[PDB]
Design an enzyme around this catalytic site. Structure first.
Site, mmCIF file in Angstrom:
data_model
loop_
_atom_site.group_PDB
_atom_site.id
_atom_site.type_symbol
_atom_site.label_atom_id
_atom_site.label_comp_id
_atom_site.label_asym_id
_atom_site.label_seq_id
_atom_site.Cartn_x
_atom_site.Cartn_y
_atom_site.Cartn_z
ATOM 1 N N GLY A 22 0.760 -1.228 0.000
ATOM 2 C CA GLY A 22 0.000 0.000 0.000
ATOM 3 C C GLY A 22 0.791 1.278 0.000
ATOM 4 N N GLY A 79 1.474 4.980 2.387
ATOM 5 C CA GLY A 79 1.349 5.647 3.671
ATOM 6 C C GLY A 79 1.171 7.137 3.411
ATOM 7 N N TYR A 117 3.446 9.287 3.961
ATOM 8 C CA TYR A 117 4.732 9.703 3.411
ATOM 9 C C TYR A 117 5.565 8.670 2.636
ATOM 10 C CZ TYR A 117 4.473 14.395 5.424
ATOM 11 O OH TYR A 117 4.084 15.696 5.668
ATOM 12 N N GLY A 118 4.965 7.567 2.195
ATOM 13 C CA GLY A 118 5.748 6.592 1.446
ATOM 14 C C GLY A 118 5.020 5.355 0.947
ATOM 15 N N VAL A 153 4.604 1.151 0.821
ATOM 16 C CA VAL A 153 4.800 0.031 1.737
ATOM 17 C C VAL A 153 4.903 -1.285 0.991
ATOM 18 C CG1 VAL A 153 3.833 -1.219 3.713
ATOM 19 C CG2 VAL A 153 3.602 1.284 3.563
ATOM 20 N N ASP A 158 -4.756 11.672 12.224
ATOM 21 C CA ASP A 158 -5.364 11.170 10.975
ATOM 22 C C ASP A 158 -5.944 9.782 11.129
ATOM 23 O OD1 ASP A 158 -4.390 10.970 7.445
ATOM 24 O OD2 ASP A 158 -6.252 11.614 8.406
HETATM 25 N N1 LIG Z 1 -0.776 3.947 6.223
HETATM 26 C C1 LIG Z 1 0.206 3.105 6.532
HETATM 27 N N2 LIG Z 1 1.302 3.450 7.200
HETATM 28 C C2 LIG Z 1 2.059 2.365 7.341
HETATM 29 O O1 LIG Z 1 3.131 2.312 7.942
HETATM 30 C C3 LIG Z 1 1.377 1.322 6.716
HETATM 31 C C4 LIG Z 1 1.689 -0.034 6.616
HETATM 32 C C5 LIG Z 1 2.911 -0.562 7.369
HETATM 33 C C6 LIG Z 1 2.452 -1.357 8.592
HETATM 34 N N3 LIG Z 1 2.074 -2.739 8.254
HETATM 35 C C7 LIG Z 1 1.328 -3.200 7.249
HETATM 36 O O2 LIG Z 1 1.094 -4.402 7.138
HETATM 37 C C8 LIG Z 1 0.706 -2.266 6.203
HETATM 38 N N4 LIG Z 1 -0.180 -2.718 5.314
HETATM 39 C C9 LIG Z 1 -0.597 -1.803 4.444
HETATM 40 CL CL1 LIG Z 1 -1.846 -2.007 3.192
HETATM 41 C C10 LIG Z 1 0.094 -0.649 4.787
HETATM 42 CL CL2 LIG Z 1 0.085 0.814 3.773
HETATM 43 C C11 LIG Z 1 0.885 -0.918 5.897
HETATM 44 N N5 LIG Z 1 0.239 1.811 6.227
#
Ligand SMILES: NC1=NC(=O)/C(=C2\CCNC(=O)c3[nH]c(Cl)c(Cl)c32)N1
EC number: 2.7.11.1
Length: 272
Positions: A15, A17, A19-20, A22, A126
């Site tokens: 996914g 985030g 700021y980045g 994942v 958020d």
């Molecule tokens: N919004 C977000 N910040 C994160 O650090 C983050 C993670 C990182 C934390 N662990 C996860 O399994 C994860 N799944 C999906 Cl989809 C996301 Cl994107 C993440 N998602």
């Protein structure tokens, strides 16, 4: 000392985030799976520093675990707990929500996480289903501290003034007051999250009088959606959470005393 044990293969994109990006990383040796947030600092090298800094302060079962970070040139890496269950967002069925017992359990876990954060003086800013992750046992974990900040330090509260968050989830004081207390803002978004879990729809585009659904709520027109889809007990809690005046808004210690919050609903996970 066990060669290759620090090697991780990026196997898929999980996914995005605040700021980045994942990625799911699997250890070459242990096959342990972690999530790696990768941030190209060619944008903002400080915003990501703060997030890493806040993550280093956290340790709670309802907060995505921070394992560490590494900088590789102009690329920041954040090793985070992988939540195989995905985003809570994906467990909410459009226009229906989810079974009340499931919503209550997720809300209990969300509260536990927020109490912990507020306890160490950190506000998320958020909270929304997209940022609430589920592990393999459907335990909820608060994620993404890209917009998080410290609101209490040396036992002195600092009022906030930065407009931050996501409009549907943001508290009305952010839109009409210059300064505001941090905690009620997070309580409000948790309130909108509960509404989404129980009705499968957000109540308003934003909490402003210009917004008709919002004035309708302030008028107490609960005979309309999404409120009509919500049972009286949890709706009673929502009437305490979704209060325009942040000073009159229910606090977490009191949410924990709410009738719906303490109503036996959900059976424990089935056992063999
Ligand atoms: N919004 C977000 N910040 C994160 O650090 C983050 C993670 C990182 C934390 N662990 C996860 O399994 C994860 N799944 C999906 Cl989809 C996301 Cl994107 C993440 N998602």
């Amino acid at each position: 000392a066990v060669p290759f044990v620090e090697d991780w293969d990026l196997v898929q994109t999980l996914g995005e985030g605040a700021y980045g990006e994942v990625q799911l990383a699997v250890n070459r040796v242990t096959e342990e799976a972690v999530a790696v947030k990768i941030v190209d600092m060619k944008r903002c090298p400080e915003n990501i520093k703060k997030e890493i800094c806040i993550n280093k302060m956290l340790n709670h079962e309802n907060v995505v675990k921070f394992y560490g970070h590494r900088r590789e040139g102009n690329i920041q890496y954040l090793f985070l707990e992988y939540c195989s269950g995905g985003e809570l967002f994906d467990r909410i069925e459009p226009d229906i929500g989810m079974p009340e017992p499931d919503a209550q359990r997720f809300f209990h876990q969300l509260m536990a996480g927020v109490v912990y954060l507020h306890g160490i003086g950190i506000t998320h800013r958020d909270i929304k289903p997209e940022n609430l992750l589920l592990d393999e046992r459907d335990n909820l974990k608060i994620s993404d501290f890209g917009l998080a900040t410290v609101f209490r330090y040396n036992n002195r509260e600092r009022l906030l003034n930065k407009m931050c968050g996501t409009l549907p989830y943001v508290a009305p004081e952010l839109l009409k007051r210059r300064e505001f207390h941090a905690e009620p803002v997070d309580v409000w978004s948790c309130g909108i999250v509960l509404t989404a879990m129980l009705a499968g729809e957000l109540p308003w585009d934003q909490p402003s009088d210009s917004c008709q659904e919002y004035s309708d709520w302030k008028e107490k027109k609960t005979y309309l959606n999404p409120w009509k889809k919500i049972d009286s007990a949890p709706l009673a809690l929502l009437h305490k959470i979704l209060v325009e005046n942040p000073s009159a808004r229910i606090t977490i210690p009191d949410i924990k005393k709410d009738r719906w919050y303490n109503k036996p609903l959900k059976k424990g996970a089935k056992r063999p």
